Amino acid sequence: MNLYTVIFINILLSLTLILVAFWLPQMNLYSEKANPYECGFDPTSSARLPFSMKFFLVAITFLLFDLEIALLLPLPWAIQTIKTSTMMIMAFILVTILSLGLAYEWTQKGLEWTE
């Protein structure tokens, strides 16, 4: 109940600040004020056109590494096991596999950016 209460109070505080901000100041709205901004000269195209990403490979690699962090996180409870040999061996294997994958992607110029 307490976590819910504190988070709801935070949400209400933020929303109240937003409402004050949007309903206190004097508003004069016209098209030039409401148009996008680009350093003084009108836009030449939309902002919704495709915006090529030069780090897509490392994005997907970040997905994979996030899941491997996922595999690693149970370690604080695991270390309490009675089969310490197996636990340590398996953790070493997992970390070594992570490192070797990173090394392969490094040597194949994967962490570099397309141009």
Binding site: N2, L3, T5, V6, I7, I9, N10, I11, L13, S14, L15, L17, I18, V20, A21, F22, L24, P25, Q26, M27, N28, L29, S31, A34, N35, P36, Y37, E38, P43, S46, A47, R48, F51, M53, F55, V58, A59, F62, F65, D66, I69, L72, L73, L75, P76, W77, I79, Q80, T84, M88, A91, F92, V95, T96, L98, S99, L102, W106, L111, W113
Partner: protein, 318 residues
């Protein structure tokens, strides 16, 4: 009474951030050979409130090309998460004792990125999109190593609960066993808060302003408030994890004071660095992390898996 506790945890934190703005400006001034603010009240103590007032009283803007939904949501989310992350912290007794406190912090901070992302997309402006995608790159950098750093220190902590760290550091700081982890953690916090040198998501030089280019008045105020709350939060997290304060069950206030001292010093160090150093190019930030921090972080993770086993020092669960 829990509501009184909520007030006593939120109001002082908001005031602390408000005055962190002034402290940053004055420290930068005195380090750049100028006095900084010193007119708005004695020694410029009213400047934060003056600026907050001005921002909340300046017109709020709804540009015609914006997705008003996310445009209004993302700032609110930013401030909400900034305030929320303070909940689980033990100083020394936490407002909310979560068993998986560190995982809570990780998940909430990771969600903070979506405020920047959605704001940058909703602005529907070119610089805003640049900022959002640079934030994507910054997160892809820091998170992978942040998680392993916390895991490596947790292998000695014994559990994911933050309150356990006090008892773990009852005799010494975690820094001494794991300064190598601590420095990477410090740089990673620097990156996470979007602070300089890694201040790329709002690189005033390259981009006039990142996500917050179309945001003005109170929404922009909310973004800034979330930023300077997160600075203090991360410095507090460092103070708790490493740089352990002193806990004497009879004298909690000693822990409270030691924590305030160390957190203030580290938060000042943030501004010190901001003034000292230039900015990275976000490709160079990503390379820094992935090709320097990540290898060493992984190697230290294996080292800290081994150390409990071969030192016969596995920590107690519970």
């Amino acid at each position: 009474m829990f509501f009184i506790n909520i007030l006593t945890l939120l109001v002082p934190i908001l005031i602390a951030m408000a005055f962190l703005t002034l402290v940053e400006r004055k420290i930068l001034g005195y380090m750049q050979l100028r006095k900084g603010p010193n007119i708005v009240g004695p020694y410029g103590i009213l400047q934060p409130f003056a600026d907050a007032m001005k921002l909340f009283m300046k017109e709020p803007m709804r540009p015609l090309t914006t997705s008003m939904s996310l445009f209004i949501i993302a700032p609110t989310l930013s401030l909400t998460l900034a305030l929320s992350l303070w909940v689980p912290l033990p100083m020394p007794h936490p407002l909310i004792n979560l068993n998986l406190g560190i995982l809570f912090i990780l998940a909430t901070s990771s969600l903070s990125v979506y405020s920047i992302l959605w704001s940058g997309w909703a602005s529907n402006s070119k610089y805003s999109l640049f900022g959002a995608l640079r934030a994507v790159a910054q997160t892809i950098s820091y998170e992978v190593t942040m998680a392993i750093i916390l895991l490596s220190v947790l292998l000695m902590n014994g559990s994911y609960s933050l309150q356990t760290l006090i008892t773990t550091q009852e005799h010494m700081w975690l820094l001494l066993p794991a300064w190598p982890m601590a420095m990477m953690w410090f740089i990673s916090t620097l990156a996470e808060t979007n602070r300089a040198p890694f201040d790329l998501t709002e690189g005033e030089s390259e981009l006039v302003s990142g996500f917050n280019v179309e945001y003005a008045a109170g929404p922009f105020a909310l973004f800034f408030m979330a930023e300077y709350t997160n600075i203090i939060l991360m410095n507090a997290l460092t103070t708790i994890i490493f740089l352990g304060p002193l806990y004497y069950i009879n004298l909690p206030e000693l822990y409270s004071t030691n924590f305030m001292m160390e957190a203030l010093l580290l938060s000042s160090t943030f501004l010190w660095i901001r003034a000292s150093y230039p900015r990275f190019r976000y490709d160079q930030l990503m390379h820094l992390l992935w090709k320097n921090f990540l290898p060493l972080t992984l190697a230290l993770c294996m080292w800290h898996i081994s150390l409990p086993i071969f030192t016969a020092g596995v920590p107690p669960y519970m």
